[PDB]
């Protein structure tokens, strides 16, 4: 080895000894170090054995022949020391190669990465020797030609995939296809033609499905708890081994990327040095291209590994949380807010998956800094210390800022949750709000919290501006400090391109690890507390099934059993004993808080058994007090997974008297009942629950007050056909918690208790004869138009200022780098450069302008986003409130809420950041291309083909990824939606013993989410590789055209072009990523303005024909030929209600009774009618005016969240004395004075704390405080009170009354009867009879 032939001569030939030693030791050596390690994978991972195919044999036979040929050399040598050891070593490694394909066949691997890279390395080594041997010119040469031809054919064979031993093609994908991710390209094509749906999505890998990952974590956590508990131990014990490879991949990727600046150094030396061989530059550019491609492949395999591991972590955590929820104790379940348990899978699971892809940064960010610093130390020297100072002045600050960001993020979710719930209260109750005309206040109420939001979003915007400044300017800031110090401390400190641009490249390579390090640390610390929460959920006590002896088929046996609701709380059921025989009806009897429901909970192993013995025999069907309804159809609610039996189902439905409920419901039993679908009354929910229990056909039934909400006739019918001895459950052991005596004599056994203690149980007649506790009990009683629209929403001046500042930034950066190229071209004079202070001053001024302009650019667009979010929320609120209630009933509340939630969040927190990042990446790519073109114009021919290659990759990915990012977001909500359902009905899940079914359903939901998430991450890793190679071949091309024209280009220009080509690599990938994110997030801005053009209500205030202050002078109502639609519900209505005359409206279901009120409040428009109050037409008056001058007490009053005073008057227009007087007149003074908060009592959503009677009296208080002459009543215990109050002082005012009860309407004169919209009778009740 001497530079005489390997470097100096224009023919770069390797020496003969080098050829025969190192070029042969490289490949043989590769297989020797990998062979042992490869058994680990081959053994731990198995897939069967591949059959005997021609390909496998062809490879094995060539491996035998290759070994022979290599040993044939040893034979001829036997017939120089290197002529013995080298052929034998090659033969032995060849014998290891053929044995390896053999064992790979045995272990079922179709595509072999080792048997592809090994042949590639051998081929390259053979190629080098081949060229040398063909340039030298029989004896030993022909053996090498045979070896090379066989190696080439072996390499070609190794590319094809062997036979296998809508599934994901990844399993059958070749290594060439598993490194380029070519197997997803089909979806990239398919997503371009046919929009994707869930069926097209590939099935999850068997090692990736929840059915496999979750039991691993469950088993490992069980082992860890049995050992002692730390969730981190299990987390890095189960997912650690697969996550290990990401480390090797990240280390190799770091080394490969650092190799780039070294090759740039060598290329700058070559260009700067004439009289050098021309092949040296070509070798350097080929090496740079190879290094860039290898770095791309290794890096993207690393992320694939990280992203798969994070997804597995999320799946396992979600499954473990779901399975632990069904075993958790009541005490513990209540300790953690239900919403908190949903958050465990909503955020904690997500945060883990998001963080996993970057855990390796904690070890590689410092490495990419330390190695870069060493590299910088090789170029500049001690001056690099100044650069370190900049890091000490940057990385900490960002970290602090990063933490603050998270804080503000939390505060954001403080206000977001503060509004969405309020928005729900607005969305559930639009009828009452429109009638009470508080639309404008709530608008401001809602608007107030948005302003509070922006108070927090603007703080986050200041932080985000600091973050983009500290990210994009980080490479320059370090470069400026280090260059200034380097050129100032020493006068002989020459600055050549080699010692500047290479360093500059390093600064681009220290941009990423430097600023992601803080973020990641932040994402670690936050994840840390999330982890603790998970541990808190996974260390909670379990409910031992042995507590209740569940013997398969004296039916229920309890002796000396005391139960608790908690370990430390006192017993709720003290010393209970009773024996319920098979097929007997037992009624639990007691007062409120006695312990009746606790008995049924104890029989289900829900109570904590401190002592005793319970021996419930056979399956148990639980009808809980609080009915649990699944969001599935009513048929599947009753079925509860069990097979459908038409005769049994049709015997169960009417026996529960569910036939009228089926009739009223739109789709019958196929209607979507539950919270999300159609809402059901409490009695209907109890029926469904009872019907589900009856269909389940258990032997033991625990009916915790099934007849609480059903009416007396319906309850008696139900007991007759279901629970009674002559019903459906005649032979079933039925336990019924009741407080109604009507069915007590039919009960076989009455268990009457007091204070959680058995108190003289027995049969009804015997208990009555005994005259004890039971007697006492009885005696008790996308086009661009949307981008233009968002640009308008931001503000045209702000947007154009942001564009101007961005252009200034990129021009400044490009000009500063060109200035550096000129500065490095200053000829050394006597060991210095004449222009050092001037050049450095220009560089510093340009960069200071660049930094301040970056700060301005980020801040400007951030403020524009704030403004756009403000205006968009104002527009959405105004349009929603202006829309009539027909729109409100038509559109599901889900999409109306989605307009305000999870979509405003994208507009206000994602779109500004994503647009900043997109614009930055796009103009960085444009600037790099411009610099390369300026340096080497001949590279222009490169632009079309690669551009074409870009275009398709730009066209295919963005079309497909969007769908993948929608479908995923489609399946994420049900996973939590199921879990919530599971959490609400845990007792019902355990009582029916259907834990496995719900566990499998949750696993299916999670797999549905992952079947869209996995294609998304693989799409990212496919797009990444595609764009990288394009940015990689331009690095090779820029370098190649620099080498071609080295006689005219200075070293500085070459280094500048190569460095910009190095960074355009990551810039192109980030460009398209953010381009797809633009469409996905700008669809939200499009959907925000989905109601701006819909039909709105009549103007609230006309102000041209406004009525006088006392508009209802007497309250003379006149329906003059009224006709209301939504063919005509109201028709031919010509009636006159005199001022201060009580009038009621009677009619059956389907008449226009209620629709008549809708006529008074102009909620809908008159198809044909001229309703006039006094001497003024209603249709001419603005809505608010009439809605303010007329009052309505609806069917169900809505108590909005807030204080009682804001309920009675949000406009706070009426004085406190008026509020007090109205509340006293509403029979509410005693109660309203009782709250500690006086008038400021904080009532929850819908007034859950208040009783129904109270809420009704609060609505009456609202109507009374209004003090209007026209009042409407909608009638459905407190009826006596509300009727008396409406008859007390409102006699002066004209009252219309729509009551489903004739008793109250009889009191009111002038009754109007509506048969089918027509006026059937118009006169006083005296004339009625």
Ligand X SMILES: C[C@]12CC[C@H]3c4ccc(OS(=O)(=O)O)cc4CC[C@@H]3[C@@H]1CCC2=O
Ligand Y SMILES: N[C@@H](CCC(=O)N[C@@H](CS)C(=O)NCC(=O)O)C(=O)O
Contact residues toward ligand X (CB under 6 A) are 468, 471-472, 516, 917, 920-921, 924, 1070
- 831 annotated to a ligand binding site: no
Q: In the complex, which residue's CB is closest to ligand X?
A: 920
Q: Residue 753 binds which one of ligand Y, ligand X, none, with CB within 5 to 8 A depending on kind?
A: none
- Work out whether strand 573-580 and strand 556-564 pair parallel, antiparallel, or are unpaired: antiparallel
- Contact pick of 238, 291, 405, 1020 for ligand Y (by CB under 6 A): 1020
Residue 1024 Cβ vs ligand Y, minimum distance, rounded to whole Å: 6
Q: Closer to ligand Y by CB, 512 or 777: give it.
A: 512
For the segment 158-177, give every residue that binds ligand Y (CB under 6 A): none
CB of 918 to ligand X, least distance (A): 8
Expressed in percent and rounded to 5, the helix, strand and coil fractions of the chain are: 65, 10, 25
Residue 1272, Cα to own-chain centre: how many angstroms? 46
1024 binds ligand Y (CB under 6 A): yes
Q: Residue 250 and residue 252: Cα distance in Å, rounded?
A: 5
Instruction: Provide the minimum distance between the beta carbon of 464 and ligand X in the complex, in angstroms, as a whole number.
Output: 9
1148 is in an annotated binding site: yes
Residue whose tokens read 């005012």: 1293
Q: Residue 1183: helix, strand or coil by DSSP?
A: helix
State the distance between the two ends of the chain, measured CA to CA, in whole angstroms.
125
Question: Closest distance between ligand Y and the C-beta of residue 170, in Å?
Answer: 18
Tell which residue, 763, 1079, 726, has the closest CA to residue 914.
1079
The smaller minimum CB distance to ligand X, of residues 291 and 522, is found at 522
Tell me which of ligand X, ligand Y, none is bound by residue 243, counting a contact when its beta carbon lies within the kind-specific cut-off of 5 to 8 angstroms.
Answer: none
**Beta bridge pairs of residue 1313:** 1146, 1321
Smallest distance from ligand Y to CB 25, Å: 31
CB of 64 to ligand X, least distance (A): 51
For the record, the structure tokens of 140 come out as 């030993």
Task: Give the x-and-dash track for 292-321 against ligand Y (CB under 6 A).
Answer: -------x---x------------------
For ligand Y, the closer CB: 739 or 1021 = 1021
- From residue 748, alpha-carbon distances to 729, 734, 766 in Å are 14, 10, 11
What is the footprint of ligand Y within residues 1077-1116 (CB under 6 A)? none
Q: Which residues, other chains included, contact 838 with Cβ-Cβ below 8 Å and sequence gap of 6+?
A: none
Nearer to ligand X, 522 or 1002 (CB): 522
| Contacted entry of ligand Y, ligand X, none for residue 38, CB cut-off 5 to 8 Å set by kind | none
572 labeled part of a ligand binding site: no
Nearer to ligand X, 590 or 920 (CB): 920
Among 67, 118, 512, 628, binds ligand Y (CB under 6 A): 512
Give the nearest distance from C-beta 971 to ligand Y in angstroms. Answer: 20
Which of the listed partners (ligand X, ligand Y, none) does 917 bind, with a CB threshold of 5 to 8 Å by partner kind? ligand X
User: Which DSSP category does 666 fall into?
Assistant: T
Specify whether the CB–CB gap between 1080 and 969 falls below 8 A: no
Q: Which is nearer to ligand Y, 153 or 371 (CB)?
A: 371
Query: Binding residue per annotation — 1154?
Result: yes
Q: Which is nearer to ligand X, 361 or 881 (CB)?
A: 361
Edge-first strand listing for the sheet containing 620-623: 620-623, 700-704, 733-737, 585-589, 749-752
1149 labelled binding-site residue: yes
Output the CA angle 923-924-926, nearest 5 degrees: 60
Residue 303 touches which of ligand Y, ligand X, none (CB < 5 to 8 A by kind)? ligand Y
Rounded least distance, CB 261 to ligand Y, Å: 13
Least Cβ distance, residue 70 to ligand Y (angstroms): 41
Cβ atoms 304, 208 nearer than 8 A: no
Query: How far is the CA of 297 from the CAs of 292, 984, 1021, in angstroms?
Result: 9, 48, 10
1290 binds, among ligand Y, ligand X, none (CB under 5 to 8 A by kind): none
Count of residues in the chain: 1329
User: Which does residue 471 bind out of ligand Y, ligand X, none, counting CB within 5 to 8 angstroms by kind?
Assistant: ligand X
CA dihedral 46, 48, 50, 51 (to 10 degrees): 160
CB of 1024 to ligand X, least distance (A): 12
1151 among the known binding-site residues? Answer: yes
Instruction: Assess contact for 1115 and 1291: CB atoms under 8 A.
Output: no
Structure-token match 């969405």, residue found: 420
Q: What is the number of the residue whose Cβ is closest to ligand Y? A: 512
Judge whether 590 is annotated as a binding position.
yes
Helix (H, G, I), strand (E, B) or coil at 1145: strand
Tell me the two tokens of residue 559.
Answer: 């002796």
593 is in an annotated binding site: yes
Instruction: Return the DSSP state at 744.
Output: G
Tokens 């309020």 correspond to: 422
971 marked as binding residue: no
Neighbours of 713 (CB within 10 A): 9
Out of ligand Y, ligand X, none, what residue 920 binds, judged by CB under 5 to 8 A for its kind, is ligand X
Q: Min. distance of Cβ 524 from ligand Y in angstroms?
A: 16
Contacting residue, 695, 774, 918, 1070, with ligand Y by CB under 6 A: 1070
Token pair for 1142: 């009580």
* Spatial distance between the Cα atoms of 243 and 608, rounded to a whole number of angstroms: 41
Tell me whether residue 1071 or residue 1261 sits nearer to ligand Y (CB atom).
1071
CA distance 479 to 477: 5
Can you give the three-state secondary structure of 533-579, one letter per residue? HHHHHHCCCECCHHHECCECCCCEEEEEEEEECCCCCCCCEEEEEEE
| Unique residue bearing structure tokens 């969040």 | 905
Output the six-digit token pair for 1198: 């809505």
Smallest gap from Cβ 910 to ligand X, in A, equals 12
- The answer on whether 125 is annotated among ligand-binding residues is no
Output 306 or 932, the one with its CB closest to ligand Y: 306
CB 468, min distance to ligand X, A: 6
924 binds, options ligand X, ligand Y, none, Cβ within 5 to 8 A by partner type: ligand X
Place of tokens 């840390």: 528
| Residue 1024 or 1286 having the CB closest to ligand Y | 1024
Q: Please say whether the beta carbons of 509 and 368 come within 8 A.
A: yes
* Interior angle at CA 1222, CA 1221 and CA 1224, nearest 5: 65
Please check if 567 is assigned to a binding site.
no
Closest CB to ligand X among 320 and 928?
928
Backbone angles phi, psi at 1147, to 5 degrees: 175, 165
In the complex with ligand X, the residue whose CB is nearer, 472 or 680, is 472
Q: Which residue has the tokens 């399946």?
A: 971
- Asked if residue 1230 belongs to a known ligand binding site, the reply is no
Residue 1063 or 1254: the one with the smaller Cβ distance to ligand X is 1063
Nearer to ligand Y, 1058 or 1160 (CB): 1058
Q: Which long-range contacts (CB under 8 A, 24 or more apart) does 120-129 make?
A: 120/155, 121/26, 121/27, 121/30, 122/27, 122/151, 122/155, 123/148, 123/151, 123/152, 123/155, 125/23, 125/24, 125/26, 125/27, 126/151, 126/152, 128/14, 128/19, 128/23, 129/14, 129/19, 129/23
Q: Which does 472 bind (CB under 5 to 8 A by kind): ligand X, ligand Y, none?
A: ligand X
Q: Closest distance between ligand X and the C-beta of residue 516, in Å?
A: 4
Give the annotated binding-site residues for ATP.
Answer: 590-597, 1147-1154
Give the annotated binding-site residues.
Answer: 590-597, 1147-1154
Q: Which residues bind ligand Y (CB under 6 A)?
A: 299, 303, 512, 1020, 1024, 1066, 1070
């Amino acid at each position: 080895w001497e530079w005489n032939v390997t470097w100096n001569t224009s023919n770069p030939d390797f020496t003969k000894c080098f050829q025969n030693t190192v070029l042969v030791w490289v490949p043989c050596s590769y297989l020797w170090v990998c062979f042992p390690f490869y058994f680990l994978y081959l053994s731990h991972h198995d897939r069967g054995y591949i059959q005997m195919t021609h390909l496998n044999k062809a490879k094995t036979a060539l491996g035998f022949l290759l070994w022979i040929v290599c040993w044939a050399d040893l034979f001829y040598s036997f017939w120089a020391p290197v002529f013995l050891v080298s052929p034998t070593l090659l033969g032995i490694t060849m014998l290891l190669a053929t044995f390896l394909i053999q064992i790979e066949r045995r272990r079922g691997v179709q595509s072999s990465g080792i048997m592809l890279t090994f042949w590639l390395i051998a081929l390259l080594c053979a190629l080098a020797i081949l060229r040398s041997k063909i340039m030298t010119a029989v004896f030993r040469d022909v053996t090498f030609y045979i070896y090379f031809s066989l190696v080439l054919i072996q390499l070609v064979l190794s590319c094809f995939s062997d036979r296998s031993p809508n599934p994901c093609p990844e399993s059958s994908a070749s290594f060439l296809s598993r490194i380029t991710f070519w197997w997803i390209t089909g979806m990239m094509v398919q997503g371009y033609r046919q929009p994707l749906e869930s069926t097209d999505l590939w099935s999850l890998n068997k090692e990736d499905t929840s059915e496999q990952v979750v039991p691993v974590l469950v088993k490992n956590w069980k082992k860890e708890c049995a050992k002692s508990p730390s969730l981190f131990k299990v987390l890095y014990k189960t997912f650690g081994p697969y996550f290990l490879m990401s480390f090797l991949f990240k280390a190799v990727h770091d080394l490969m990327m650092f190799a780039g600046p070294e090759i740039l150094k060598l290329l700058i030396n070559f260009v700067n040095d004439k009289k050098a061989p021309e092949w040296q530059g070509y070798f350097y550019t080929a090496l740079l291209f190879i290094s860039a491609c290898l770095q791309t492949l290794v890096l993207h395999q690393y992320f694939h590994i990280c992203f798969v591991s994070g997804m597995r972590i999320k799946t396992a955590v979600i499954g473990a949380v779901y399975r632990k929820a069904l075993v958790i104790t009541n005490a513990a379940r209540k300790s953690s807010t239900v919403g908190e348990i949903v958050n465990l899978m909503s955020v904690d699971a997500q945060r883990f998956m998001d963080l996993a892809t970057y855990i390796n940064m904690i070890w590689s960010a410092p490495l990419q800094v330390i190695l870069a610093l060493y590299l910088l130390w090789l170029n500049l020297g001690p001056s690099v210390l100044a650069g370190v100072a900049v890091m000490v002045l940057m990385v900490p600050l960002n970290a602090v800022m990063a933490m603050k960001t998270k804080t503000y993020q939390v505060a954001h979710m403080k206000s977001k949750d503060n509004r969405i719930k309020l928005m729900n209260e607005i969305l559930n109750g639009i009828k009452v709000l429109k009638l009470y005309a508080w639309e404008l206040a709530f608008k401001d109420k809602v608007l107030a919290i948005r302003q509070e939001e922006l108070k927090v979003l603007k703080k986050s915007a200041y932080l985000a501006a600091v973050g983009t400044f500290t990210w994009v300017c980080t490479p320059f800031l370090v470069a400026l400090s280090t260059f200034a110090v380097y050129v100032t401390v020493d006068e002989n400190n020459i600055l050549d391109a080699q010692k500047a641009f290479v360093s500059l490249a390093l600064f681009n390579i220290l941009r990423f690890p430097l600023n992601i390090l803080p973020m990641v640390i932040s994402s670690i610390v936050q994840a840390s507390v999330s982890l603790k929460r998970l541990r808190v959920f996974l260390s909670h006590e379990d409910l031992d099934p042995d507590s209740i002896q569940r013997r398969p088929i004296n039916s229920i046996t309890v002796k000396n059993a005391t139960f608790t609701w908690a370990r430390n709380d006192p017993p709720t059921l003290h010393g209970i004993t009773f024996s319920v025989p098979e097929g007997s009806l037992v009624a639990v009897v007691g007062q409120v808080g006695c312990g009746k429901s606790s008995l049924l909970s104890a029989l289900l192993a829900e109570m904590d058994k401190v002592e005793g013995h319970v021996t419930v025999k056979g399956s148990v069907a639980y009808v809980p007090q609080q009915a649990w309804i699944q969001n599935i159809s009513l048929r599947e609610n009753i079925l509860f997974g069990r097979q459908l039996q038409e005769r049994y189902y049709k015997a169960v439905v009417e026996a529960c008297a569910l036939l009228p409920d089926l009739e009223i419901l739109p789709s019958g039993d196929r209607t979507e009942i539950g919270e999300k679908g159609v809402n059901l009354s409490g009695g209907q929910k109890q029926r469904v629950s009872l019907a589900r229990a009856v269909y389940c056909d258990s032997d033991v039934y625990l009916l915790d007050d099934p007849l609480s909400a059903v009416d007396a006739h319906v309850g008696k019918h139900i007991f007759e056909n279901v629970i009674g001895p002559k019903g459906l459950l005649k032979n079933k052991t039925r336990l019924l918690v009741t407080h109604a005596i009507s069915y007590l004599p039919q009960m076989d056994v009455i268990i009457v208790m007091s204070g959680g203690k058995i108190s003289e149980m027995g049969s009804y007649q015997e208990l009555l004869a005994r005259d004890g506790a039971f007697a006492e009990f009885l005696r008790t009683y996308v086009k661009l138009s949307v981008y233009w629209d968002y640009m308008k929403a931001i503000g045209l001046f702000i947007s154009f200022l942001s564009i101007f500042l961005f252009l200034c930034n990129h021009v400044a950066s490009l000009v500063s780098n060109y200035w550096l190229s000129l500065w490095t071209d200053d000829p050394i004079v006597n060991g210095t450069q004449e222009h050092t202070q001037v050049r450095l001053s220009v560089y510093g001024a340009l960069g200071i302008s660049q930094g301040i302009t970056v700060f301005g650019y980020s801040m400007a667009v951030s403020i524009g986003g704030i403004f756009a979010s403000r205006r968009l929320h104002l527009d959405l609120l105004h349009n929603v409130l202006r829309s009539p209630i027909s729109f409100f009933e038509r559109t599901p509340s889900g999409n109306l809420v989605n307009r305000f939630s999870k979509e405003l969040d994208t507009v206000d927190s994602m779109i500004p950041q994503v647009i900043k990042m997109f614009m930055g990446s796009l103009f960085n790519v444009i600037g790099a291309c411009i610099i390369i073109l300026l340096a080497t114009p001949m590279a222009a021919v490169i632009i079309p083909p690669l551009g074409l290659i870009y275009f398709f990759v730009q066209r295919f990915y963005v079309a497909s990824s969007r769908q993948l990012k929608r479908l995923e977001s489609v399946s994420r909500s049900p996973v939590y939606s199921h879990f919530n359902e599971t959490l609400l009905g845990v007792s019902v899940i355990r009582a029916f013993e259907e834990q496995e079914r719900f566990i499998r359903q949750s696993d299916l939901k999670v797999d549905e989410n992952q079947k869209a998430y996995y294609p998304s991450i693989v799409a990212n890793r496919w797009l990444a590789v595609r764009l990288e190679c394009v940015g990689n071949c331009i690095v090779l091309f820029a370098s190649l055209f620099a080498v071609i024209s080295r006689h005219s280009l200075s070293a500085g220009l070459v280094g500048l072009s190569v460095s910009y080509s190095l960074q355009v690599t990551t810039y192109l990938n980030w460009l398209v990523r953010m381009s797809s994110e633009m469409e996905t997030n700008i669809v939200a801005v499009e959907r925000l303005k989905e109601y701006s053009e819909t039909e709105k209500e009549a103007p609230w205030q006309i102000q041209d024909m406004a009525p006088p202050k006392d508009w209802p002078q007497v309250g003379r109502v006149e329906f003059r030929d009224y006709g209301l639609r939504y063919d005509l519900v109201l028709k031919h209505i010509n009636v006159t209600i005199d001022g201060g005359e009580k009038v009621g409206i009677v009619g059956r279901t389907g008449a226009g009774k209620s629709s008549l009120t809708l006529g008074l409040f102009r909620i809908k428009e008159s198809a044909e009618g001229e309703i006039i109050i006094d001497d003024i037409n209603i249709a001419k008056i603005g809505l608010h005016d009439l809605r303010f001058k007329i009052t309505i007490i609806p069917q169900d009053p809505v108590l909005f969240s807030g204080s009682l005073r804001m309920n009675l008057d949000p406009f706070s227009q009426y004085s406190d004395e008026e509020v007090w007087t109205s509340l006293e007149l509403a029979h509410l003074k005693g109660f309203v004075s009782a709250l500690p908060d006086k008038l400021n009592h904080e009532c929850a959503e819908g007034g859950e704390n208040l009783s129904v009677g109270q809420r009704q009296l609060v609505c009456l208080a609202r109507a009374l405080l209004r003090k209007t002459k026209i009042l409407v009543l909608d009638e459905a215990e407190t009826d006596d009170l509300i009727q008396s109050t409406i008859r007390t002082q409102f006699d002066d005012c004209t009252v219309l009354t729509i009551a489903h009860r004739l008793n109250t309407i009889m009191d009111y004169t002038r009754v109007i009867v509506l048969d089918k919209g027509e006026i059937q009778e118009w006169g006083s009740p005296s004339d009625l009879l």
